[PDB]
Amino acid sequence: TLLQREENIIRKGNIDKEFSEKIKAAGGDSLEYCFQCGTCTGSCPSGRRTPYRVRQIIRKANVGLKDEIISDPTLWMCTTCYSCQERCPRKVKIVDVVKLARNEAAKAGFMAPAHKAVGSFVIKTGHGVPINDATMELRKAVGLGELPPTTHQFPEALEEVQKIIKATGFDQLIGYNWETGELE
Amino acid sequence: TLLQREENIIRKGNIDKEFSEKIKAAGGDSLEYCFQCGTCTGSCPSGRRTPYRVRQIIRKANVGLKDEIISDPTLWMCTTCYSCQERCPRKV
Amino acid sequence: MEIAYFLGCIMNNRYPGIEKATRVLFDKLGIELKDMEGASCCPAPGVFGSFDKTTWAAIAARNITIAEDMGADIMTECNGCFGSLFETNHLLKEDEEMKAKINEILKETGREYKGEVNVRHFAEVLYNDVGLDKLSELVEKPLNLNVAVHYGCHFLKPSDEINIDNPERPTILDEIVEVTGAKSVEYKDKMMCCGAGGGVRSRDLDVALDFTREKLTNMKEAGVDAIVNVCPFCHLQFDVGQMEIKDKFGEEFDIPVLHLAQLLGLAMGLVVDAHQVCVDECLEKL
Amino acid sequence: MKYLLARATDEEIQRKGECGGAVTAIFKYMLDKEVVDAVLTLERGYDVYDGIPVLLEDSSGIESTCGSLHCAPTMFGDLISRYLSDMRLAVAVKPCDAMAIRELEKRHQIDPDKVYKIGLNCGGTLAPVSAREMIETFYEIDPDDVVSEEIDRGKFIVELRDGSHREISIDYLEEEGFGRRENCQRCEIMVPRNADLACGNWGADDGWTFIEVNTERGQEIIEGARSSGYIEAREPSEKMVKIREKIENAMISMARKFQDKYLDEEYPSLDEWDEYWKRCINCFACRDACPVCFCRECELEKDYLLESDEKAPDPLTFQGVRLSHMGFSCINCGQCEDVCPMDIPIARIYHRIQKKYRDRTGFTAGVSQELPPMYSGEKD
Amino acid sequence: VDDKALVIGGGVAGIQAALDLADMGFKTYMVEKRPSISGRMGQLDKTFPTLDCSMCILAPKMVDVGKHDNIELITYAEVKEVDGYIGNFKVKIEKKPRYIDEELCTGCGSCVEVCPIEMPNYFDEGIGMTKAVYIPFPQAVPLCATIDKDYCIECMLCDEVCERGAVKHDQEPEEIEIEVGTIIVATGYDAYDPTEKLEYGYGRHTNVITGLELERMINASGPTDGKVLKPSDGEKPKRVAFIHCVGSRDEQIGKPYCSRVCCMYIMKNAQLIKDKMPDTEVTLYYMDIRAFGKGFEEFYKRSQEKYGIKFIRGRPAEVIENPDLTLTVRSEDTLLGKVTEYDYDMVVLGVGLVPPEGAETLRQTIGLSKSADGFLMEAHPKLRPVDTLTDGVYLAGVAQGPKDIPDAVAQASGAAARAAIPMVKGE
Amino acid sequence: MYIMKNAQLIKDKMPDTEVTLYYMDIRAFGKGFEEFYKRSQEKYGIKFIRGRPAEVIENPDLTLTVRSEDTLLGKVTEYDYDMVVLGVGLVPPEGAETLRQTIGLSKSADGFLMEAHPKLRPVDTLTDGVYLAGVAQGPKDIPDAVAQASGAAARAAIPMVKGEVEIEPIIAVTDSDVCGGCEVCIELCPFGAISIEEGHANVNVALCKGCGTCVAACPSGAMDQQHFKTEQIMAQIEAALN
Amino acid sequence: HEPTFRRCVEEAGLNQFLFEFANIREHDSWVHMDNPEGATEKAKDLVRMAVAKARLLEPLEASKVSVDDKALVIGGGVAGIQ
Amino acid sequence: FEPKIVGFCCNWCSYGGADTAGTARMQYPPNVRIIRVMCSGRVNASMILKAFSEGADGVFVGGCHIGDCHYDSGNYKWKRRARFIEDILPEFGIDKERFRWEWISASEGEKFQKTMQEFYETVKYLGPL
Numbered sequence A: 001t002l003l004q005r006e007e008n009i010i011r012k013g014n015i016d017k018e019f020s021e022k023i024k025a026a027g028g029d030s031l032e033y034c035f036q037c038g039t040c041t042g043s044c045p046s047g048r049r050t051p052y053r054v055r056q057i058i059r060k061a062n063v064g065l066k067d068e069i070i071s072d073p074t075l076w077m078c079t080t081c082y083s084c085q086e087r088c089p090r091k092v093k094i095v096d097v098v099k100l101a102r103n104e105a106a107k108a109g110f111m112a113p114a115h116k117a118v119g120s121f122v123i124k125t126g127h128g129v130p131i132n133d134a135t136m137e138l139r140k141a142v143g144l145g146e147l148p149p150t151t152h153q154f155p156e157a158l159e160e161v162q163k164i165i166k167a168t169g170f171d172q173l174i175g176y177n178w179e180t181g182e183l184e
Numbered sequence B: 001t002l003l004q005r006e007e008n009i010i011r012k013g014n015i016d017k018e019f020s021e022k023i024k025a026a027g028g029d030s031l032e033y034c035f036q037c038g039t040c041t042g043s044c045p046s047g048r049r050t051p052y053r054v055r056q057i058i059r060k061a062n063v064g065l066k067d068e069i070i071s072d073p074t075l076w077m078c079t080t081c082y083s084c085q086e087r088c089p090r091k092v
Numbered sequence C: 001m002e003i004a005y006f007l008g009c010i011m012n013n014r015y016p017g018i019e020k021a022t023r024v025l026f027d028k029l030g031i032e033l034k035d036m037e038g039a040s041c042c043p044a045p046g047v048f049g050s051f052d053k054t055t056w057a058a059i060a061a062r063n064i065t066i067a068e069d070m071g072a073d074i075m076t077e078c079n080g081c082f083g084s085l086f087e088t089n090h091l092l093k094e095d096e097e098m099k100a101k102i103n104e105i106l107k108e109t110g111r112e113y114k115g116e117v118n119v120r121h122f123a124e125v126l127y128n129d130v131g132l133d134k135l136s137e138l139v140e141k142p143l144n145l146n147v148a149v150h151y152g153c154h155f156l157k158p159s160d161e162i163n164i165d166n167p168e169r170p171t172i173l174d175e176i177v178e179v180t181g182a183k184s185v186e187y188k189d190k191m192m193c194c195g196a197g198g199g200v201r202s203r204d205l206d207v208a209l210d211f212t213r214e215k216l217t218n219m220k221e222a223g224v225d226a227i228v229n230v231c232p233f234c235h236l237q238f239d240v241g242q243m244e245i246k247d248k249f250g251e252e253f254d255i256p257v258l259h260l261a262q263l264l265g266l267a268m269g270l271v272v273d274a275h276q277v278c279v280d281e282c283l284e285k286l
Numbered sequence D: 001m002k003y004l005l006a007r008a009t010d011e012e013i014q015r016k017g018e019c020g021g022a023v024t025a026i027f028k029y030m031l032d033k034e035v036v037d038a039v040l041t042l043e044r045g046y047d048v049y050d051g052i053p054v055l056l057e058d059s060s061g062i063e064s065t066c067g068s069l070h071c072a073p074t075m076f077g078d079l080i081s082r083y084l085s086d087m088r089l090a091v092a093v094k095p096c097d098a099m100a101i102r103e104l105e106k107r108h109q110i111d112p113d114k115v116y117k118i119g120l121n122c123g124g125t126l127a128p129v130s131a132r133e134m135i136e137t138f139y140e141i142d143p144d145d146v147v148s149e150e151i152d153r154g155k156f157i158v159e160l161r162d163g164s165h166r167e168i169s170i171d172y173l174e175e176e177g178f179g180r181r182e183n184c185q186r187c188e189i190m191v192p193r194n195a196d197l198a199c200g201n202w203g204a205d206d207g208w209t210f211i212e213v214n215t216e217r218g219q220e221i222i223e224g225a226r227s228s229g230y231i232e233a234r235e236p237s238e239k240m241v242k243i244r245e246k247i248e249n250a251m252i253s254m255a256r257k258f259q260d261k262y263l264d265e266e267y268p269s270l271d272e273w274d275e276y277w278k279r280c281i282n283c284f285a286c287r288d289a290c291p292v293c294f295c296r297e298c299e300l301e302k303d304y305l306l307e308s309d310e311k312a313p314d315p316l317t318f319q320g321v322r323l324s325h326m327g328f329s330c331i332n333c334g335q336c337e338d339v340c341p342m343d344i345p346i347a348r349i350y351h352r353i354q355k356k357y358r359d360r361t362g363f364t365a366g367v368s369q370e371l372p373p374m375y376s377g378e379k380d
Numbered sequence E: 001v002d003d004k005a006l007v008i009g010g011g012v013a014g015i016q017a018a019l020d021l022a023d024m025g026f027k028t029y030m031v032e033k034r035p036s037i038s039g040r041m042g043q044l045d046k047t048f049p050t051l052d053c054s055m056c057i058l059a060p061k062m063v064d065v066g067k068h069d070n071i072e073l074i075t076y077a078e079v080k081e082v083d084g085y086i087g088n089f090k091v092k093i094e095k096k097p098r099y100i101d102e103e104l105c106t107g108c109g110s111c112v113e114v115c116p117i118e119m120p121n122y123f124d125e126g127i128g129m130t131k132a133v134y135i136p137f138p139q140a141v142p143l144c145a146t147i148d149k150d151y152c153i154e155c156m157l158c159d160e161v162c163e164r165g166a167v168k169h170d171q172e173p174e175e176i177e178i179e180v181g182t183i184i185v186a187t188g189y190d191a192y193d194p195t196e197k198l199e200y201g202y203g204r205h206t207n208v209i210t211g212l213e214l215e216r217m218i219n220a221s222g223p224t225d226g227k228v229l230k231p232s233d234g235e236k237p238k239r240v241a242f243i244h245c246v247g248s249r250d251e252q253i254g255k256p257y258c259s260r261v262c263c264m265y266i267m268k269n270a271q272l273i274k275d276k277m278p279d280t281e282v283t284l285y286y287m288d289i290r291a292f293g294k295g296f297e298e299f300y301k302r303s304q305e306k307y308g309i310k311f312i313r314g315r316p317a318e319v320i321e322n323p324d325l326t327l328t329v330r331s332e333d334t335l336l337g338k339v340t341e342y343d344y345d346m347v348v349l350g351v352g353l354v355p356p357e358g359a360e361t362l363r364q365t366i367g368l369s370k371s372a373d374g375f376l377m378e379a380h381p382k383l384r385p386v387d388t389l390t391d392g393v394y395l396a397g398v399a400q401g402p403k404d405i406p407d408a409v410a411q412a413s414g415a416a417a418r419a420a421i422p423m424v425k426g427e
Numbered sequence F: 001m002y003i004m005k006n007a008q009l010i011k012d013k014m015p016d017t018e019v020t021l022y023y024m025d026i027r028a029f030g031k032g033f034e035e036f037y038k039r040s041q042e043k044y045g046i047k048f049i050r051g052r053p054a055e056v057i058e059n060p061d062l063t064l065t066v067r068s069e070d071t072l073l074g075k076v077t078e079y080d081y082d083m084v085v086l087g088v089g090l091v092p093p094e095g096a097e098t099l100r101q102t103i104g105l106s107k108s109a110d111g112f113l114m115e116a117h118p119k120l121r122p123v124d125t126l127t128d129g130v131y132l133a134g135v136a137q138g139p140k141d142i143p144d145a146v147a148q149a150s151g152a153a154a155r156a157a158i159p160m161v162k163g164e165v166e167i168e169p170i171i172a173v174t175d176s177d178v179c180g181g182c183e184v185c186i187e188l189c190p191f192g193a194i195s196i197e198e199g200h201a202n203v204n205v206a207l208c209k210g211c212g213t214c215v216a217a218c219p220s221g222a223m224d225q226q227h228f229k230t231e232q233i234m235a236q237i238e239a240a241l242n
Numbered sequence G: 001h002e003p004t005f006r007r008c009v010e011e012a013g014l015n016q017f018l019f020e021f022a023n024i025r026e027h028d029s030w031v032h033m034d035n036p037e038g039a040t041e042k043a044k045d046l047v048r049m050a051v052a053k054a055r056l057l058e059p060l061e062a063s064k065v066s067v068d069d070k071a072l073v074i075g076g077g078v079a080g081i082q
Numbered sequence H: 001f002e003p004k005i006v007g008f009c010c011n012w013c014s015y016g017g018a019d020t021a022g023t024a025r026m027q028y029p030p031n032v033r034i035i036r037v038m039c040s041g042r043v044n045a046s047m048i049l050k051a052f053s054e055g056a057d058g059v060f061v062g063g064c065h066i067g068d069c070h071y072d073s074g075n076y077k078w079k080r081r082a083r084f085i086e087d088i089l090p091e092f093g094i095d096k097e098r099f100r101w102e103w104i105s106a107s108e109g110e111k112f113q114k115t116m117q118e119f120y121e122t123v124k125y126l127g128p129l
């Protein structure tokens, strides 16, 4: 059956004005004056191969459709290439709105395990792409040190990074477990 | 994966101008001057509870997306109540 | 002159040849590179900016404070790291409330952000502080190479803040490439993304590899010997995604990927063993 | 060339120069090569505390104008507008001198074409008699023995006739009611970037003058002075150009702290201001000394404003009227407070009003080349 | 050619034409069917795109017209007959009975104070009340009272209260014959009546109003003292919707033309509502936003940015009245591609412009041809926009078709020049 | 309107050619413009796509692909065309600024010449004796420009018909003995009545309207308004309070 | 009624700008009907202000500026042609 | 305590507004004395300071609404001067509530009456200056 009485009509039950006001106050106020020309979607390389429509994301953010946005997987198809922002005739900060919506989606719990993995790597070692043994051998051979002058080498730098992470609440966001060092 | 190389872009490969000519010759000539106001979809009682969208059907018929139309199940959600046709400002 | 040197992750942990070539080139130019001891991820903007802005800004500001203590400008040869650090720097410079919050966070670590330094890009430093005439002097080997220059999204955009070159039809990297004797070849959708930015590479590898496959197709249609980039992130995409495309779609492109530093090192007299796409033919074609 | 390190090629000029004698060499070149018709500078009188303005038409014996006189809180803009208006000229300017000349130039009282501005870095000046009293009280020396004076690592330091140096922390002196003038402690501008050249010692070694070229005209000056060999130049280390930036930032932060002190915390109350205004003798010395008050006939002397009786004027019709007239263009030069026979802190109130206007509208008196928004012909 | 002119209509275009002709040295008659001049411009609160007061700038011009030595103003009168040709027009006008002596009346208003009958005020567009003896608005020119005998009961209290003896219940209609060389038709327009659009429920739903009624309510001199209040209960609305192209661009009602001003005045009234009540939510339902004039596109962007007005692209399908008297607008958001049923406390219809009542009578009297949209036809659409094929007759303002105040004023000045040329030549 | 006109003309010349328009809004506001819009579709079969194209890409064979979103279909489209026509807008002509400074006029935000009053004086300027006609005042079509030109002719003729203009003597006057030549008053006159001669301010009698803004702005009091002199107002203040 | 009294004085031979007006009806008498004493004092104050202004008035003459009957049209387009 | 209030009203709107209030017989306190100028652009700080120094407890200025000026920009210059005067006045012990500047149109008799009533009440509450 094609009957779906809830996903095919918009009423006040689908709208959250607080969400849009919060997005506008956080640095995405320009979305208030989008006139829906569609230049951003025509410029988007992710909209040519996925169901991602940036213009409709901006529209939904302006209308308050919070659940339709934060739960949307296509929100994570933006590469932040800035082509849309470079071409918007109203000078809307499209990427800022996209990132703010992503922040809200993450706090709501829509995070991918791979992004959580990258975050856990940064928590563990301070690098999102930590070094492996083969590259250690390559560095040793070429003339550089086995470990670079980074948190890989200085534990105190790693401790500073981890307290920053604890201070900002990132570990609780990604559900990190300090006791076992695992994504709980 | 959300990747879909074909369903998210319209090229000439998706267009049959012969289908549009056939529709317009058989008595659908009026679809040629719809200006996409959206009164028909707002009036549609099927569009309120199904993914049926009469305005997009008229648009596709004008463009010539034959496969996008004939294979669409939502094409069969119209009760022919005529509300859209009663309210259309272009008399489509 | 002197300039603080930021490494990132990929260049120093996956492609040390870029680092070695940059170090050699910059002493050949009488510019002293001072290491930023204790530096960490920029952090990578795609994931951290998408998850939490405060954490990203705090980590980037902590990285900037190192160069501030060294009292020198930061130089980056990565579009992603340049974008992250540049955005953090002027965001904190152009407002005080965010600066206050970031400083309150950093207090626990014993660091204070002052905003007394500038973030600069490898290619911009070469173009301005050195000049095309100064670099033409150090070419011992005119190169014979049709090259596909990949600018990357975050080198020039957002151009409202960066103001280095025109995002649509830039020329800076083409001029730096042509200094070495290589010919830059125009190809379709030159200014397109590689697909790695914004976290997509970690969330949907199929979409990112589609980006890379499209540009590789255009590049091959243009008949280019090698790809030249200024981003280790784009380097990793073009290098590992080629093998991934081979493994998945069986689509063979063999176009070696080179950083701008490595191309400058080929002229002027590389740890290519770290590259998943063999560069031996390209060198032999020289 | 944004920055340079310059010094005179004449041995006499470099010896007598405060900082390698670059400024004197530029003046000597400008007079000798006829770039300008005259040079307006200072020259010590019968002691270091007596700096008198001098207008030199030729360079013969120009080295008598060398050196810095920290106890000469002079204004040159008023002299350039009253009497030297139709002369091509080169003038040594502290940032307040340049501010006054800029405010007068935007009001067409000085021709910017005819005036060359070799500005000097200024960390403050002192009143001469107060400086002598300070040296007597705290340095425990005869003031007549002092041969030179400078402020630096927070220190007023005095060279002596014997040849030694005596140092006292300027924080102590300024907390004991001495040291730089109160308006100088609030001064927010240290490098004269509203001048053609900006010469100082904050990024220079010994025997060299650190010069920042602000305008193409400054570039022409420097080029003409080097080509003829009047000045020899080199380029600062960029480790020096950063030490200078840090020093300037620290100075500006301290100036802002002193503004918050004198204009907010230690600002006199309304009763104290009543006590002060009771003293006024209606002499108009503040108006005469103010560089921004240039009018041929002053409104304050009209029959409906002027105080007829031999009593204190109503503060409104005198001070409030002058404020409404020019308080958005107050440069905090302190001349009005300097010359007041009754020791009224006029500059405090005028600077506070200018600061309110700047905070509301963002207009910086003496820096912006345009008129205040008050005189805007747009409907902003 | 006679060196005198006639101007039919007392709106901004007619006022401009009369003043231009009189300043050029031509004696000019002005005929106005309402008791006072002003037209529709005098009914607006503010104007777009500057949001500046309308009456504050028009009232000096009305006083100038009323005081001019070269202008004879005849208000409350109609042109009954026109005969002759260019330079030799014979015009019969009929002045209706005011039952007040225009000479004696000073407009003090005591008669209005004492009158015991209440009738709708035409100036308030059906949402304001006055007495049987009334002055249309304080800035009226002439500032004279009028008596509507359809409502007068002949209590003679106005007679008692009048100190100038200006009340004349025995007055009769007057016949005036004039000779003019040229005629300028400046009869303006009327607002479309959306009662026939049964789906939007105007005239049935309490809280559905038109744009002109909103202009009167917003006006500080209007019946509500400038307060926008729900007709149902007299409280301010927290949610307001605006519908564009009501009575325009619709072939179901034979109105295939654009009214050319409704977008701008809809946005203007939304901005005014937001100004008066910043917490009110305003949504506009549109097909196209026609912000084409000077400063109009910036006005549109400012409506979105400064005031946070919501724009929905879609022609509403229906307006439904809930039992609590709130209104559900059922419309497709075409840019989201989905149906929406949004609830509002008030709905305002962006009605269009139609030719005024009695337009056909005057058109036949003069002998002019009308255009496809029902307005008067100019001699050549491109190069003679104010002329007609009838020599000596010219058009000015919305009589030639919908347009905004600057366009009407420019046309009025042009019509004055074109009429002056024959009267200057004299043959 | 001219895009639609040219599309109709192409279809008339070449019945078999396919024409598509990429638009944001269709501004058919003038008389008969909406019927023109409808006839573009009903009679000539011109296609309308609502969407601002993101890019135009040249193919090797020189055909042009227009990458644009169909916002009403909600999908990206890449259609190929033999020719692409750009609906370029209107800008002030070359040398507009030189003439504007020559006459002394003021320009509006959009770069065109500014009218005295947006509503009631569309063809007049605050510079007496100068009037604007046509697109010089701002973009518009031929009938609007013709109406503006006729109106400008009328407004210009009125003063010339009169042959003289009377100026009320409540005008401003400068004392050359007190004027310092500071020129801060010059830009405060909206009618440009003040100029500088021989280093002193001069008020043109014919251009002064008698507002008194320059008088209130002059610090030294070299400018005074007849019938509203500073002495008179001060006397009135004193009398009111004493 | 300022034009009325200006005309009266000018016909009397006195310059029309040597006349001053005090408003004691709209500004005083029609708005202070409850305070006859206050109204009278305010009228005295207003008359005093009017006399104070009158003491300093001067005779002024309107100026006449000739207007040449030739026009210049810059631009030879359709608007300029029209 | 009866405060002494001096008013400046532009000829074209604010004087007309007071006249409109008078014609409608709207009553307001007798304390204000109105001085007529052609435009509010004629008023400067010297007038206000003179009024306060001559014994005025409050000073009122009334101009045309922004955009309505009969001379097209005078009230803009006056508004600039009024903001600067608000900055200046408290420095000499004058509460800025004693200085009231408003835009009144020639038809706003009620606005004029209410403004006069509220200004009189405010100045009376403040007391002698």
Ligand SMILES: Cc1cc2nc3c(=O)[nH]c(=O)nc-3n(C[C@H](O)[C@H](O)[C@H](O)COP(=O)(O)OP(=O)(O)OC[C@H]3O[C@@H](n4cnc5c(N)ncnc54)[C@H](O)[C@@H]3O)c2cc1C
Pocket: D016, D017, D018, D019, D020, D021, D022, D023, D024, D025, D041, D042, D043, D051, D065, D066, D067, D068, D069, D070, D071, D072, D073, D074, D092, D093, D094, D120, D121, D122, D123, D124, D125, D199, D200, D201, D202, D203, D209, D210
């Ligand atoms: C009061 C004062 C404060 C200063 N404070 C600083 C400071 O804090 N930091 C800094 O880096 N530099 C400061 N300088 C400038 C410093 O002395 C430089 O070393 C010097 O100006 C560089 O040029 P020079 O030594 O080649 O000039 P010189 O060859 O010594 O010539 C300097 C010229 O300046 C003229 N002059 C103009 N105004 C004055 C005045 N008020 N007193 C004395 N001479 C004057 C002299 O008469 C002379 O002609 C100050 C200068 C003065 C006068």
Ligand SMILES: Cc1cc2nc3c(=O)[nH]c(=O)nc-3n(C[C@H](O)[C@H](O)[C@H](O)COP(=O)(O)OP(=O)(O)OC[C@H]3O[C@@H](n4cnc5c(N)ncnc54)[C@H](O)[C@@H]3O)c2cc1C
Pocket: E008, E009, E010, E011, E012, E013, E014, E031, E032, E033, E034, E036, E037, E038, E039, E040, E041, E044, E046, E047, E048, E049, E077, E078, E079, E186, E187, E188, E189, E190, E191, E211, E212, E215, E261, E265, E268, E356, E358, E362, E396, E397, E398, E399, E403, E404, E405, E406, E408
């Ligand atoms: C709600 C609304 C808001 C608007 N807002 C604005 C705005 O903000 N800015 C703007 O620029 N424009 C606005 N407009 C448009 C503007 O009102 C018109 O452009 C303008 O009123 C046209 O003036 P006119 O003289 O041509 O016609 P009208 O104003 O209609 O005047 C015509 C006159 O002729 C009289 N008349 C009619 N028939 C006869 C007859 N047979 N004999 C004698 N006299 C007759 C009428 O009674 C009236 O006095 C708005 C319009 C509407 C409906």
Ligand code: SF4
Pocket: A033, A034, A035, A036, A037, A038, A039, A040, A041, A055, A058, A084, A087, A088, A089, A090, A091, A092, A094
């Ligand atoms: S380009 Fe800008 S204005 Fe157009 S739809 Fe995208 S965000 Fe909105």
Ligand code: SF4
Pocket: A040, A043, A044, A045, A046, A047, A054, A077, A078, A079, A080, A081, A082, A083, A084, A085, A094, A095
């Ligand atoms: S930044 Fe994101 S939304 Fe914008 S064009 Fe790039 S991928 Fe698309």
Ligand code: SF4
Pocket: B033, B034, B035, B036, B037, B038, B039, B040, B041, B055, B058, B084, B087, B088, B089, B090, B091, B092
């Ligand atoms: S109502 Fe008519 S014109 Fe509007 S979208 Fe439907 S078919 Fe098209």
Ligand code: SF4
Pocket: B040, B043, B044, B045, B046, B047, B054, B077, B078, B079, B080, B081, B082, B083, B084, B085
């Ligand atoms: S006939 Fe009824 S069901 Fe079919 S499209 Fe029209 S309104 Fe919808």
Ligand code: SF4
Pocket: D073, D094, D095, D096, D097, D122, D123, D124, D125, D183, D184, D185, D187, D188, D189, D332, D333, D334
């Ligand atoms: S006011 Fe400033 S520039 Fe002038 S002497 Fe004092 S510190 Fe130097």
Ligand code: SF4
Pocket: D289, D290, D291, D292, D329, D330, D331, D332, D333, D334, D335, D336, D337, D346, D347, D350, D351
């Ligand atoms: S008011 Fe005093 S401090 Fe201000 S510029 Fe005049 S003299 Fe200098």
Ligand code: SF4
Pocket: D287, D292, D293, D294, D295, D297, D298, D299, D300, D321, D322, D325, D326, F219, F220, F221
């Ligand atoms: S007080 Fe006023 S009039 Fe007198 S000199 Fe200063 S600015 Fe000029």
Ligand code: SF4
Pocket: D279, D280, D281, D282, D283, D284, D285, D286, D287, D336, D339, D340, D341, D342, D343, D344, D346
């Ligand atoms: S200098 Fe001092 S005493 Fe003399 S008038 Fe000024 S404030 Fe009064």
Ligand code: SF4
Pocket: E100, E104, E105, E106, E107, E108, E109, E110, E111, E112, E144, E145, E161, E162, E163, E164, E165, E166, E167
């Ligand atoms: S008819 Fe008499 S009472 Fe009525 S308004 Fe006229 S003058 Fe006043």
Ligand code: SF4
Pocket: E114, E115, E116, E117, E131, E132, E133, E147, E151, E152, E153, E154, E155, E156, E157, E158, E159
């Ligand atoms: S006679 Fe008529 S107008 Fe007069 S008071 Fe009676 S009802 Fe009213």
Ligand code: SF4
Pocket: E244, E245, E246, E248, E249, E257, E258, E259, E260, E261, E262, E263, E264, E288, E289, E290, E350, E352, F029
């Ligand atoms: S102006 Fe706007 S609202 Fe009015 S008819 Fe035209 S499109 Fe519709």
Ligand code: SF4
Pocket: F174, F178, F179, F180, F181, F182, F183, F184, F185, F186, F200, F201, F217, F218, F219, F220, F221, F222, F223
């Ligand atoms: S009139 Fe006054 S403001 Fe104007 S230039 Fe002369 S002195 Fe300056």
Ligand code: SF4
Pocket: F171, F172, F188, F189, F190, F191, F192, F193, F194, F203, F207, F208, F209, F210, F211, F212, F213, F214, F215, F225
């Ligand atoms: S009084 Fe007004 S109109 Fe006359 S010159 Fe001065 S500013 Fe211009």
Ligand code: FES
Pocket: H010, H011, H012, H013, H014, H038, H039, H040, H041, H063, H064, H069, H070, H071, H072, H073, H074, H075
């Ligand atoms: S006329 Fe009243 S403010 Fe200009």
